[model samples]
Target chain A: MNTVPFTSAPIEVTIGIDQYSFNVKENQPFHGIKDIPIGHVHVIHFQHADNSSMRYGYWFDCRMGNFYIQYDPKDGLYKMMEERDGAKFENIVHNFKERQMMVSYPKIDEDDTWYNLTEFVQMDKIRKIVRKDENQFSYVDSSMTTVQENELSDPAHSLNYTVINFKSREAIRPGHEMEDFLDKSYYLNTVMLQGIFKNSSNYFGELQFAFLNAMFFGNYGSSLQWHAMIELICSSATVPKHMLDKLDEILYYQIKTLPEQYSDILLNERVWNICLYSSFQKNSLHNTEKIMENKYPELL
Target chain B: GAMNSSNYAELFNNDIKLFVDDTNVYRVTVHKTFEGNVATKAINGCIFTLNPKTGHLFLKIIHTSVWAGQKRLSQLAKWKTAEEVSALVRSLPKEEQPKQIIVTRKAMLDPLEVHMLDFPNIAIRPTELRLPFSAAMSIDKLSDVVMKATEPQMVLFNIYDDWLDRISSYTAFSRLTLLLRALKTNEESAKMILLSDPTITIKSYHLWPSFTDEQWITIESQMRDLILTEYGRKYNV
Candidate 1:
């Protein structure tokens, strides 16, 4: 009876391929499994649409802790785990801001084991296991009758249930400078949301400029070699914002006049992700193509 | 002006030579241009000496015509015509930029120095940018002649017939006209595209981007398996 249906409110989606913004309390009942009906789970958070003192939960022991009912079919977005129970899909590894995890699971019989998510992991910094009063999931349906004691092992009841379910006012715990600023702003916003999802998906340099204009000019041009192979063929398709601000202003002017290991290893932590994508480009190349054409014109 | 200096004294400058010997040589001059948007007026110039007894750097066909952007072949790839040939090799005269100064080739007729002289962008560079041993040509002290702009020590070659001019027409002078067309076709390549030495080795020396137009398009389809293993070459069909 997979009655998984449960969104009476918190439903904003957009996670992977960097649509990032989240709020899905999908079913939200982590503390209620009293004997039967224990459905609706996945709860992921991540606020700050303009800062409510920056709230975040990033899915913890999401009931049965199976990475909060994993998602991403290309943008469904909530996968802190479950790449078909790992060992593939690029071998799942996790470390939610020092919460360290690994996955590869198998053995009810034998083979693939790598699973290290210290079972039913518990914690509660005094009384607030998931409720200060009466666990308000305010959501209803399929009555499991009772068990609101919900301490399925705490991260301080998901850090005061992630600051009162990201509506914020209390629960801000998870410090160490707020888990080093949401683990380096969740890996520099998922590696600049993979070149802004191929600059808002599409524009493979307009089909490699219509196949290098009929294989290097013929109904007109020839052997003056397509200008040394068209900027490595329109720089491998697209990530245009003037090629990420001329690939971060040609690596900070060859790290200030080349040599010193020539711009010391250009990137991948490349000058700290090109200085945080040039402070979300208040840095230039005309404000990095005017902040992706005045706030991402579907990334041109 | 006497019928344009007697028809620039009738064409063909003794079938192009400029060297066999001028005793321990070094002249290097690439001015005005072979000829241009003119109806008349004799503005002739060309000379580049460093034969330093057979090490080939002579393109001396002085007073020749037919080469000024060979008629606007697409505004000759500009970076202001690679700074009007880097402002005529910084407008020479530190005694013809040579008591032995060899700023190889920034002698403008440039379409960004003719895609910086193309030959597979001087066979995938890195010998301190096709040797003149850096410090950007030792900060224009033209790094005292890198072994007389040496040859691969001999299989022999030199084709400055406007050396691979305007090689990539323009896309912001295709990486500074392919690093000044591999600093004047540094030569040797029956054909080559070898890889695995990208400045150079910590899993491809910090993966990439030392200008091949942002290392051949910086994202390479965001590693769609590193864009078919860096746009597939050498072996992987």
Candidate 2:
């Protein structure tokens, strides 16, 4: 039998005709600090160094739970690009100023319930049960609080697995097919972030409202951040996972801090590395203080 | 089908996938490793995307039911052409609109692809020519409506007649089989009763409902015999 060696080096994943490749490394910061998590994704685009003048570049960890990375070649830094993770997915998104989103026929429109980064961490866990029902209530992804019982009537089901936007988002007219029951399609939902309603079961269709929320703004620095953030959140809109805080925590920290330098290689590594440690049960006050301070110190 | 990697995309071709952040959702495994020169690249560019939840596997069949999905004649897609929808989506405000829409067809499908920054990891499952009504569907139910057949089913049947030599489609195939079998009967005895009549009609054949099923079988049988004798096994149809 042949021998197989195991390693966690920066891996290169080809993206096409030799133009670019995704390199998986490891997230360095959060793992090192006493209170931080063991790791985050540590992947990089190996081709970046050969392609640009910058030492390391912009890869906003604009996504979490699921990996959602983007490339910005036009921005100042050696005209380069990179991808990063979760915390940044939201921290950078929720704060954006609202603008007008003119959506029309132009287009149409994950599953990470929870779990996150840890370092000197003690631990944490969830309940796994399906044997019974009733008595116990259902959970709202919007909040941890239990609500009124699973009601009567019915909540519409949308199995639109994905979207390839083809229409504009304005007050609309139905298609010849839509001519039948157009009224049923008109359910007014003005609730902002997780407002009174949004389809939780709709894996992809669920994102329309969030996509609509972020829709109002153009690409300010905060704009793409919101797109990245909302998408990261919307990415998790599944059957039970419904964009919960547990999932949000995954990208929020990364999003809250500075965008990763060089490459968001760390996030991918964190994602693939087979290493997991207990949460840091540190009673030290200063330990938590310096956590965010040097989160991106690998800057130098 | 053993859908490991090589044939996974082919197996699921044209199937809708609920591609959540795939890496987290899947437990990726590689059965073998490549060479180091190639291995170096492998280490650098490893990708892992999931298929579906644990054991529940399903793919939606987008056959576009005529009676259930729509009532009109879908003989082929109508409305605007594929190009218009493509351009419409491409030029829309890029900053805010949702990028990925649920891809239902091939026509305007490519436009939605632009939204995939982190597209799900699946091999090349191509889209098709989804020109609306271009589908050539919505039969039977619309017949009740007498929806002015821009091209009646008979004309469609004649289209088969035009090129049984270059032919296609199950609907047409079954109809020909039945008509041809009925023609095989040697009921007509007079010399000019059959072959001579076809020669007179020249090349243009059409609907003659007055002949009734009883007599029409002979002509259809004749048509098949003529086809078989001339081309026999040589004909593709």
- List A-chain TM-scores for all predictions: 0.18, 0.21
Candidate 2 lDDT, A1-300, residue by residue in tens:
110011112222221101123332332111000111113211122233333322231111112232222333354221212224545533322222122111111111231211122211111100101111221211111111111112202222111112211122221223422221121122111212333234432322223212211111111222222233233333221213333433344334333332345224323222112111111111121322244334643322
**Any idea what lDDT model 2 has?**
0.25
**Candidate 2, residue A106: lDDT:** 16
The sequence of per-residue lDDT tens digits that candidate 1 reaches over residues A1-300 is 111111122234322101123233444322111111123222234332333332323222223423222444464333233323533321222222123221111124341110111111121211232343332221111111112123324333321211011111111122222222212322222332343323311222222221222221110111111121222212222334645544433323222321233122221232233333443332433432343334333313
Best by TM-score: 1
The C-alpha stretches of model 2 lying farther than 4 A from their native spots are: A1-173, A176-300, B1-206, B209-217, B226-232, B235-237
Model 2, position A244, has a per-residue lDDT of: 45
Error of 1 at A262 (Å): 24
lDDT of 1 by residue, B121-224 (tens): 11111111222211122111122232233321111122211212423212322222233233323311100221333562222222112334344443222223
- Candidate 2 chain A lDDT trough over 10 residues, lowest sum: A123-132
After superposition of all CA atoms, the RMSD between model 1 and the true structure is: 28.2
Q: What is the lDDT of residue A155 in candidate 2?
A: 23
